[PDB]
Amino acid sequence: APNQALLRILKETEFKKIKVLGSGAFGTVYKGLWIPEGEKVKIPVAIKELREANKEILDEAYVMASVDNPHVCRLLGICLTSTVQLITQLMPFGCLLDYVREHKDNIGSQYLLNWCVQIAKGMNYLEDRRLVHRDLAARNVLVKTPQHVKITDFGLAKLVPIKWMALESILHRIYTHQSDVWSYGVTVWELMTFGSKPYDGIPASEISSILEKGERLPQPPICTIDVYMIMRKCWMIDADSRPKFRELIIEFSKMARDPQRYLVIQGDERMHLPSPTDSNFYRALMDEEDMDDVVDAD
Numbered sequence: 488a489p490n491q492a493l494l495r496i497l498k499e500t501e502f503k504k505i506k507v508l509g510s511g512a513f514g515t516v517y518k519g520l521w522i523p524e525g526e527k528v529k530i531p532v533a534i535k536e537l538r539e540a541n542k543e544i545l546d547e548a549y550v551m552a553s554v555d556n557p558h559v560c561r562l563l564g565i566c567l568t569s570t571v572q573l574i575t576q577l578m579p580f581g582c583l584l585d586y587v588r589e590h591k592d593n594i595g596s597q598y599l600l601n602w603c604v605q606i607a608k609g610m611n612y613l614e615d616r617r618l619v620h621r622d623l624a625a626r627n628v629l630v631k632t633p634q635h636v637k638i639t640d641f642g643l644a645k646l647v648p649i650k651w652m653a654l655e656s657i658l659h660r661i662y663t664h665q666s667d668v669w670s671y672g673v674t675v676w677e678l679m680t681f682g683s684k685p686y687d688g689i690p691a692s693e694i695s696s697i698l699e700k701g702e703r704l705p706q707p708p709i710c711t712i713d714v715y716m717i718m719r720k721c722w723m724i725d726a727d728s729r730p731k732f733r734e735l736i737i738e739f740s741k742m743a744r745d746p747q748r749y750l751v752i753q754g755d756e757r758m759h760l761p762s763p764t765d766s767n768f769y770r771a772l773m774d775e776e777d778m779d780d781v782v783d784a785d
């Protein structure tokens with residue numbers, strides 16, 4: 488029974504879908520416009536209309552609306568009609584998966600390590616709340632600004648990403664904070680490869696036997712062995728042997744302090760974090776919310 492004041496019930500008359508942004512396995516993402524009651528103003532919003540109980544949907548949506556963390560997208564409004572529409576703050580930059588693909592071999596080491604830090608802080612918040620995401624992947628990490636990423640779609644899996652799933656989840660539908668750690672390792676791998684698809688050319692049916700044999704995702708060319716060992720540690724068979732989100736925040740923050748020693752990127756001395764001037768601009772314009780300082784190179 489969380490705070491019902493975090494979820495605003497929207498009527499079909501207060502909003503309108505205008506543009507198409509993309510679509511995934513759960514639904515289609517639209518750029519929306521909210522017209523608040525008794526007002527003339529049009530306010531951009533992001534709307535996800537689902538693909539396929541009202542009391543039960545709302546119960547889950549209140550939990551989804553209670554996630555208050557700088558690296559977790561909070562559900563803001565819901566519109567229950569014949570379809571289920573979810574409303575959240577519009578993010579022009581979209582997902583990190585497409586951002587890294589559209590910026591292939593053009594992303595600095597400071598960005599990658601800081602994103603790994605931020606994703607770990609978002610998941611660590613979810614673990615403190617005893618919440619399991621179940622669908623962590625670079626497609627479910629949104630870019631607020633290039634220096635601020637946030638985990639999206641928490642609770643959508645509750646209402647199959649085999650290549651992002653831990654073996655116990657594939658075999659026994661078991662989902663814990665430690666299976667989320669496995670998915671996180673796969674997500675870090677997607678970033679380090681600038682958007683590569685994991686186990687490309689391998690049918691989803693073969694993955695469980697491939698894992699049981701001891702096969703894992705290859706070392707991305709930019710990762711030193713210390714970075715690869717952390718990703719490997721995330722894919723251990725024994726869930727309790729895998730690192731904690733708590734430990735991943737510290738390890739990746741320590742690595743962000745010496746970026747060149749942990750990632751080998753060509754043209755990296757040029758690709759630095761933005762000047763205070765450009766970060767002040769981005770913040771006042773599109774990121775007023777309070778977040779921890781991005782880890783700088785000593």
Ligand SMILES: *CCC(=O)N1Cc2nc(-c3cc(-c4ccccc4F)c(F)cn3)n(-c3ccncn3)c2C1
Pocket residue numbers: 508509516533534535551560561562573574575576577578579581582583584585626627629639640641643
């Ligand atoms: C690579 C894919 C991509 O570019 N995007 C995926 C995506 N989803 C959403 C989104 C998510 C949600 C949402 C958030 C919390 C809980 C439940 C839930 F459905 C939503 F309501 C609406 N959109 N976006 C998105 C796009 C633009 N601004 C914000 N979110 C993307 C982008």
